[PDB]
Amino acid sequence: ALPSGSDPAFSQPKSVLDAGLTCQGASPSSVSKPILLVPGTGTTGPQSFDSNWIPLSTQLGYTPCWISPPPFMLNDTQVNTEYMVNAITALYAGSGNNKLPVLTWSQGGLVAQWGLTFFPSIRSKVDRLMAFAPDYKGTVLAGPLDALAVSAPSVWQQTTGSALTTALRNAGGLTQIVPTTNLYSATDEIVQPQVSNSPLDSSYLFNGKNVQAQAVCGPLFVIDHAGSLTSQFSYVVGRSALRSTTGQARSADYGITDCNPLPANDLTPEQKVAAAALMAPAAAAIVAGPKQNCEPDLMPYARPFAVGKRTCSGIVTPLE
Amino acid sequence: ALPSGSDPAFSQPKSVLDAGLTCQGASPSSVSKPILLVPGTGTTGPQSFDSNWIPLSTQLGYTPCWISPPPFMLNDTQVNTEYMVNAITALYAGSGNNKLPVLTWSQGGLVAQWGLTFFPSIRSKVDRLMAFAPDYKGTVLAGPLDALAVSAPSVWQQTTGSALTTALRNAGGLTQIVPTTNLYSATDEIVQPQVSNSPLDSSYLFNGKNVQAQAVCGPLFVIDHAGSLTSQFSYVVGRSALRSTTGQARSADYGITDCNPLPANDLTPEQKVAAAALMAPAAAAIVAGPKQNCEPDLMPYARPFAVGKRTCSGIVTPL
């Protein structure tokens, strides 16, 4: 999507946003075939991707670039999105005004879709989105009031029924904006519900290529939240999505013989071990990170889409 | 005619097997009215039963005991069975040479029936078997063997067509050996087929008390794989099976009134919540657990019963 016209203002200075962006062996200002990687909750770019998509995308002929919004993607998802929008602007220009793919994990997919919904300028700059275990509807397992009654800003925002997920939906963001592949698992221990292989699932986008692992590999196939990113099966789907002339993974490119739940074949032993252990640093970062007792306020551009929801400043009222 | 003669040798030492057995507030060597609980795939004893049959069997006057074969029942089902056979032997002696009931979930039932088939010594030590969602035929939801993803030893073995399930059937193990009750559900999302209310069902044993939930409660009655263990309906049938003088649940003890799919009434609100989330640890153990590209070899005692099947070492022969 609904939003059109000018991009909303950034809350952060451009220098700060630029500082959050790194490319492997290149500057964002001058880069061949960039791919933008957007990390999960409780991680930096390298922490999410060093053991997986950084080397995997390099072997596919891309220059991997990533953002690391501080602290470990725990702050307001709306701020995390500024890093991504700025990065797309930078990398589009830096590759000679060529569209670039965006590849994400977890919250990273929500961030990507938020950017595409509310910042119209990047819609023509993103070639495709390959999202692993995205939580567009949030999760019923977030538990912001479980244990200590405070939780990270972005954990509030990723809780099902949040003002943020409300705004995304009501602005048209549950339909794909660029060609999108969503790879996810019914057994995801972080993001639920994911079990239905239908629009009920948190990772589902209308018109998207929605690939629930169990729909391909069978009802008893098990990959968790991290495995959704790191598995050989995930690699085969991601490879298809990145190569496809439709901008989405193709069913003919993957099958039952690709149903390997272990870390991608082409990873080094060290990378495979690190890929298996992906969740550990994230849990540690969440434990020691910022926490509060309310969902962060929506930025003005998003408020009209969640009237009636409650954030830190109170109930969202209509915006003049 | 069932396997006879001496029990097969254990691959594991007694001390290791003993370490897998725990009783609630008792030593296995001296326990009043033990019940042996055998867990599902990807779980320990406490993970399978803390929220359900541990407290429920306690209220019925038993001392719950359980085995926890490492790692989380994902190893070869034949080794998991050694844990059970050892436990039955220990608990029989620990309760003054009196037969004891065995209560199982999922793979646990397969383990119990495998033990009864191939280890004759325990036939005289098991009073009755109460099996919830047992997969005696394995499951077809895994797909065919030649297409199976790298999987845990016991996951191979529970795939329909496996050498293990073949051996159990051909040795005579799909007919009850001790008085057995099998409680299962047509809507089981892990174990199929279960829809026919007939010998076709994976949970069915000939001569057993075979209780498909929907045959009593109607086609709208829904309990999943975990719900087959934890439901109020499951409790009533289980209570019947444990008390019955025939050693099997009696139709006189359960009916339409008992058709409640929610966790057993007597469980605390927290136990009910934990019961509903029974499956989550299983997924986690599978992710972190052993995986291989072939079905584990059958032990020598079982080989004659699966000739022409393929395991890791090659084609099964009588050897």
From Swiss-Prot, chain A:
Source organism of this protein record: Pseudozyma antarctica (Yeast)
Broad enzyme group:
hydrolase
| InterPro entries attached to this UniProt entry | AB_hydrolase_fold, Stereospecific_Lipase
Task: Identify which residues the record assigns to the active site.
Answer: 106, 188, 225
Q: Which reaction does it catalyse?
A: a triacylglycerol + H2O = a diacylglycerol + a fatty acid + H(+)
- The enzyme's E.C. designation: 3.1.1.3
Which named protein is this? Lipase B
Q: Which residues are glycosylated?
A: 75
